[PDB]
Curated annotation (Swiss-Prot), chain A:
Heterodimer with UBE2N. Binds CHFR. Belongs to the ubiquitin-conjugating enzyme family. This is Ubiquitin-conjugating enzyme E2 variant 2. PANTHER family: UBIQUITIN-CONJUGATING ENZYME E2. Keywords: Acetylation, Ubl conjugation pathway. Disulfide bonds: none annotated. Gene3D superfamilies: Ubiquitin Conjugating Enzyme (3.10.110.10). Induction: Up-regulated in cultured fresh blood cells upon treatment with vitamin D3. The gene is UBE2V2. GO terms for cellular component: cytoplasm; extracellular exosome; nucleoplasm; nucleus; UBC13-MMS2 complex; ubiquitin conjugating enzyme complex. Residues 5-140 form the UBC core domain. GO terms for biological process: DNA double-strand break processing; error-free postreplication DNA repair; positive regulation of double-strand break repair; positive regulation of protein K63-linked ubiquitination; postreplication repair; protein K63-linked ubiquitination; protein polyubiquitination; protein ubiquitination.
Swiss-Prot record, chain B:
There is a cross-link at K91 (Glycyl lysine isopeptide (Lys-Gly) (interchain with G-Cter in ISG15)). It is an enzyme of class 2 (transferase). It catalyses: S-ubiquitinyl-[E1 ubiquitin-activating enzyme]-L-cysteine + [E2 ubiquitin-conjugating enzyme]-L-cysteine = [E1 ubiquitin-activating enzyme]-L-cysteine + S-ubiquitinyl-[E2 ubiquitin-conjugating enzyme]-L-cysteine. It comes from Homo sapiens (Human). Keywords: Acetylation, ATP-binding, Cytoplasm, Disulfide bond, DNA damage, DNA repair, Isopeptide bond, Nucleotide-binding, Nucleus, Transferase, Ubl conjugation, Ubl conjugation pathway. One of its GO terms (molecular function) is ubiquitin protein ligase binding. Activity is inhibited by binding to OTUB1, which prevents 'Lys-63'-linked polyubiquitination. Activity is inhibited by GPS2, leading to prevent 'Lys-63'-linked polyubiquitination. Its EC number is 2.3.2.23. This is Ubiquitin-conjugating enzyme E2 N.
Length: 140, 149
């Protein structure tokens, strides 16, 4: 089983992020284009239609640590959101509450995490949660 | 159950007969991943510096090119801000007849003779073309700042 080392995997994800995938409702890229460690990423999720997230752009911070992708990345919303599994005061995504993270596989990627969060925004338990005002962000 | 003979061969010859000015050592977890240090070549503005590079041999090697990247910041028209190297034999002109050693040699030579004329050179190329003296001094400055420890 040939494992692709972290940095070469992240270069692959950088190229895929630049090319974009699907309908463009999720996107990702490096937070700092001079970050040779490839650690800090910006994620974007367009809130899905017919949910209380609709017509909102969500920005996220995704951190790929030294063990990525054997281990999942850390994820936090910058844009305020009320959603199960997201700390409603800090924006931190609780890995134990988001299946893609809790059951992480090394075949997953930043794309997959963002797609999962977007899919979960359509879940019955999330789609009708009343939201904070648009454009608000957490501190720090 | 293990690596192809060619990889065993290239790995072992790299550690037995290293390229002058280049150290190349295996990763402690991944037998296809190597940690390389290239000394700045004699008479270049990188001279005296040591530059970390990583090298990976993908599943399809040698049909597929080895993957290489600088992990030390370097000011050079053919190495970008993330350490990616523009070298034809890492893409266009790779063939199974080439080997890891050819790559490391080519990279050393690239540091010795930067090519700001390359169509795909980064934004540093303009400086190298129009004020080469200043660009070379900046390359030396970055060697002092990033490549001496």
């Amino acid at each position: 089983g040939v494992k692709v080392p972290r940095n070469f995997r992240l270069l692959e994800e950088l190229e895929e992020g630049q090319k974009g995938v699907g309908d463009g409702t999720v996107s990702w890229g490096l937070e700092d284009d001079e970050d040779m460690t490839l650690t800090r990423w910006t994620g974007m999720i367009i809130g899905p239609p017919r949910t209380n997230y609709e017509n909102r752009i969500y920005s996220l911070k995704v951190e790929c640590g030294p063990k990525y992708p054997e281990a999942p990345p850390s994820v936090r919303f910058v844009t305020k959101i009320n959603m199960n599994g997201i700390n409603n005061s800090s924006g931190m995504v609780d890995a134990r509450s988001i299946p893609v993270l809790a059951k992480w596989q090394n075949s997953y990627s930043i794309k997959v995490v963002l797609q999962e969060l977007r899919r979960l925004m359509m879940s019955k338990e999330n789609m009708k949660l009343p939201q904070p005002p648009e454009g608000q962000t957490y501190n720090n | 159950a293990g690596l192809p003979r060619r990889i065993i061969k290239e790995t072992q010859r790299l550690l037995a007969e290293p390229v002058p000015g280049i150290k190349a050592e295996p990763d402690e977890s991944n037998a296809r991943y190597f940690h390389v240090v290239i000394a700045g070549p004699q008479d270049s503005p990188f001279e005296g510096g040591t530059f970390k590079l990583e090298l990976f041999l993908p599943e399809e090697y040698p049909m597929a090119a080895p993957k290489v990247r600088f992990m030390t910041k370097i000011y050079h028209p053919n190495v970008d801000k993330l350490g990616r190297i523009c070298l034809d034999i890492l893409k266009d002109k790779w063939s199974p007849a080439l080997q890891i050693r050819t790559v490391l040699l080519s990279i050393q030579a690239l540091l010795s003779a930067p090519n700001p004329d390359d169509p795909l050179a980064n934004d540093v190329a303009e400086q190298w073309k129009t004020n080469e003296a200043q660009a070379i001094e900046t390359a030396r400055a970055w060697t002092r700042l990033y490549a001496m420890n």
